[PDB]
Design a protein around this motif. Sequence first.
Motif, PDB file in Angstrom:
ATOM      1  N   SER A 171       0.810  -1.201   0.000  1.00 52.57           N
ATOM      2  CA  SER A 171       0.000   0.000   0.000  1.00 52.57           C
ATOM      3  C   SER A 171       0.849   1.257   0.000  1.00 52.57           C
ATOM      4  N   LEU A 172       0.321   2.318  -0.596  1.00 50.89           N
ATOM      5  CA  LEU A 172       0.955   3.635  -0.642  1.00 50.89           C
ATOM      6  C   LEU A 172       0.009   4.584   0.055  1.00 50.89           C
ATOM      7  N   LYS A 173       0.574   5.535   0.785  1.00 47.13           N
ATOM      8  CA  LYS A 173      -0.172   6.587   1.451  1.00 47.13           C
ATOM      9  C   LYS A 173       0.379   7.905   0.939  1.00 47.13           C
ATOM     10  N   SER A 174      -0.426   8.950   0.992  1.00 43.60           N
ATOM     11  CA  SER A 174       0.065  10.259   0.599  1.00 43.60           C
ATOM     12  C   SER A 174       0.819  10.872   1.774  1.00 43.60           C
ATOM     13  N   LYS A 175       1.840  11.705   1.468  1.00 47.86           N
ATOM     14  CA  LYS A 175       2.568  12.477   2.473  1.00 47.86           C
ATOM     15  C   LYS A 175       1.629  13.583   3.043  1.00 47.86           C
ATOM     16  N   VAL A 177      -2.007  14.263   2.370  1.00 47.54           N
ATOM     17  CA  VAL A 177      -3.408  13.959   2.704  1.00 47.54           C
ATOM     18  C   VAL A 177      -3.550  12.527   3.302  1.00 47.54           C
ATOM     19  N   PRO A 178      -3.864  12.385   4.613  1.00 51.29           N
ATOM     20  CA  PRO A 178      -3.852  11.041   5.235  1.00 51.29           C
ATOM     21  C   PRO A 178      -4.738   9.906   4.691  1.00 51.29           C
ATOM     22  N   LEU A 179      -5.973  10.205   4.285  1.00 50.88           N
ATOM     23  CA  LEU A 179      -6.908   9.199   3.763  1.00 50.88           C
ATOM     24  C   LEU A 179      -6.632   8.724   2.320  1.00 50.88           C
ATOM     25  N   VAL A 180      -5.772   9.455   1.582  1.00 52.38           N
ATOM     26  CA  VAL A 180      -5.379   9.116   0.214  1.00 52.38           C
ATOM     27  C   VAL A 180      -4.536   7.847   0.281  1.00 52.38           C
ATOM     28  N   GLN A 181      -5.019   6.786  -0.363  1.00 52.78           N
ATOM     29  CA  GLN A 181      -4.342   5.492  -0.312  1.00 52.78           C
ATOM     30  C   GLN A 181      -4.534   4.732  -1.593  1.00 52.78           C
ATOM     31  N   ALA A 182      -3.499   3.968  -1.991  1.00 49.97           N
ATOM     32  CA  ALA A 182      -3.503   3.070  -3.150  1.00 49.97           C
ATOM     33  C   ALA A 182      -3.130   1.684  -2.640  1.00 49.97           C
ATOM     34  N   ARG A 237      -8.212   5.110  -2.924  1.00 48.52           N
ATOM     35  CA  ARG A 237      -9.121   5.720  -1.957  1.00 48.52           C
ATOM     36  C   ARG A 237      -8.860   7.221  -1.960  1.00 48.52           C
ATOM     37  N   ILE A 238      -9.894   7.999  -2.244  1.00 49.40           N
ATOM     38  CA  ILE A 238      -9.774   9.459  -2.316  1.00 49.40           C
ATOM     39  C   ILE A 238     -10.814  10.140  -1.435  1.00 49.40           C
ATOM     40  N   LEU A 283     -17.856   3.057  -7.910  1.00 47.37           N
ATOM     41  CA  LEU A 283     -17.324   3.771  -6.767  1.00 47.37           C
ATOM     42  C   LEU A 283     -18.040   3.234  -5.534  1.00 47.37           C
ATOM     43  N   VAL A 284     -17.263   2.915  -4.498  1.00 44.92           N
ATOM     44  CA  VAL A 284     -17.799   2.459  -3.223  1.00 44.92           C
ATOM     45  C   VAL A 284     -17.491   3.574  -2.236  1.00 44.92           C
ATOM     46  N   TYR A 285     -18.510   4.028  -1.513  1.00 42.59           N
ATOM     47  CA  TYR A 285     -18.382   5.114  -0.548  1.00 42.59           C
ATOM     48  C   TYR A 285     -18.268   4.572   0.853  1.00 42.59           C
ATOM     49  N   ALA A 286     -17.161   4.887   1.526  1.00 43.89           N
ATOM     50  CA  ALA A 286     -16.880   4.472   2.902  1.00 43.89           C
ATOM     51  C   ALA A 286     -15.820   5.385   3.487  1.00 43.89           C
ATOM     52  N   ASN A 287     -15.929   5.685   4.799  1.00 45.58           N
ATOM     53  CA  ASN A 287     -14.973   6.496   5.570  1.00 45.58           C
ATOM     54  C   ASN A 287     -14.747   7.889   4.944  1.00 45.58           C
ATOM     55  N   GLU A 288     -15.836   8.499   4.406  1.00 39.08           N
ATOM     56  CA  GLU A 288     -15.838   9.833   3.783  1.00 39.08           C
ATOM     57  C   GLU A 288     -14.908   9.916   2.544  1.00 39.08           C
ATOM     58  N   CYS A 289     -14.745   8.770   1.851  1.00 36.70           N
ATOM     59  CA  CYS A 289     -13.909   8.602   0.679  1.00 36.70           C
ATOM     60  C   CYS A 289     -14.675   7.872  -0.403  1.00 36.70           C
ATOM     61  N   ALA A 290     -14.196   8.017  -1.645  1.00 38.89           N
ATOM     62  CA  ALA A 290     -14.643   7.229  -2.785  1.00 38.89           C
ATOM     63  C   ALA A 290     -13.537   6.152  -2.966  1.00 38.89           C
ATOM     64  N   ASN A 291     -13.940   4.891  -3.182  1.00 43.85           N
ATOM     65  CA  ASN A 291     -13.034   3.764  -3.376  1.00 43.85           C
ATOM     66  C   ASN A 291     -13.339   3.162  -4.739  1.00 43.85           C
ATOM     67  N   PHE A 292     -12.306   3.005  -5.575  1.00 48.75           N
ATOM     68  CA  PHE A 292     -12.484   2.461  -6.911  1.00 48.75           C
ATOM     69  C   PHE A 292     -11.184   1.810  -7.371  1.00 48.75           C
ATOM     70  N   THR A 293     -11.196   1.149  -8.533  1.00 47.41           N
ATOM     71  CA  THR A 293      -9.962   0.551  -9.067  1.00 47.41           C
ATOM     72  C   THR A 293      -9.573   1.185 -10.398  1.00 47.41           C
ATOM     73  N   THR A 294      -8.305   1.006 -10.772  1.00 43.62           N
ATOM     74  CA  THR A 294      -7.714   1.456 -12.034  1.00 43.62           C
ATOM     75  C   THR A 294      -6.672   0.427 -12.477  1.00 43.62           C
ATOM     76  N   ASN A 295      -6.532   0.234 -13.774  1.00 43.47           N
ATOM     77  CA  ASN A 295      -5.520  -0.682 -14.344  1.00 43.47           C
ATOM     78  C   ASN A 295      -4.308   0.108 -14.806  1.00 43.47           C
ATOM     79  N   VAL A 296      -4.409   1.442 -14.752  1.00 41.19           N
ATOM     80  CA  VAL A 296      -3.354   2.331 -15.267  1.00 41.19           C
ATOM     81  C   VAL A 296      -3.015   3.443 -14.270  1.00 41.19           C
TER      82      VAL A 296
END
Length: 322
Positions: A171-175, A177-182, A237-238, A283-296
């Motif tokens: 997993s990757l986190k943003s420096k 924004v805390p909830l930003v995750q891949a 997760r955004i 898009l799946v909505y949870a923890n005040e974020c949008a959750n989705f996937t990308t292949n690129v």
Amino acid sequence: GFLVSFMVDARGGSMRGSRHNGLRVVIPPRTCAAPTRITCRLVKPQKLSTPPPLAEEEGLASRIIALGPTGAQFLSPVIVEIPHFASHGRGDRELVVLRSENGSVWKEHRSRYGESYLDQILNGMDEELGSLEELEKKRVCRIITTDFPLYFVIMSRLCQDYDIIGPEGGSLKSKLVPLVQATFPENAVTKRVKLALQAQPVPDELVTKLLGNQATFSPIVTVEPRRRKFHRPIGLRIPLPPSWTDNPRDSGEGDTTSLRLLCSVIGGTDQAQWEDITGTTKLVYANECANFTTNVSARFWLSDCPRTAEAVNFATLLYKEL
């Protein structure tokens, strides 16, 4: 040719150069043991025998300053504020303080007690130090140091941060924004690679100035490097645009939803070509974020934009000014 030249002792002191140069030198109490003449001069880059060896996307963002006496050592940090002339804002590029001890080698300036300790560094001095937000608006850089090298200069460069992910996933986190995750599942990559999850906050003041209350936005999230294809879908997760977290105007499920997902796949420093991809992905909505996937890898941006057909035009106008 001194911008400032002033005597300072254990009581501390400060001086500003002319309004044309904007230099401010702050010597807190108890940093200077004996009376010392503090000076600062500008240095012509073309006069340097060995100028900073700039990479393709690197540039000098300030004048080169020579603080005197060269080699001065302070008992605790001193502060130097100087204006910058960077040609960009927030995004793919950042400003970094560089120093050179003797004019031959240029390295990043290290400060152990920096911006997190401004009030402590002042040592009871009656001086006002603006926040990083106020300095950002005024286009001023702040150098916190315990010594004077021969030269200081601000440099603009591509963000240097990255994490390493291999075929075992991770997993990757943003420096910023805390909830930003891949989330990288197993086999998304075939080898250990450098990746960065860049999250650029979008200031409400800018959105208000350009778009009024027509839309709000999430931070811009970029999976770096762009132009990469993954072997498995990557989870992202955004944080939602602020008006959507407060009270969603609709379910966010239909294609006419006011919550738009914008995407930009183009490469290039601070380049984007926004496309509305709402409805192309779940898009799946949870923890005040949008959750989705990308292949690129790409840039992603959410906008609560009731005038849905204008989402790309609004994003484009705003992105130019970020």
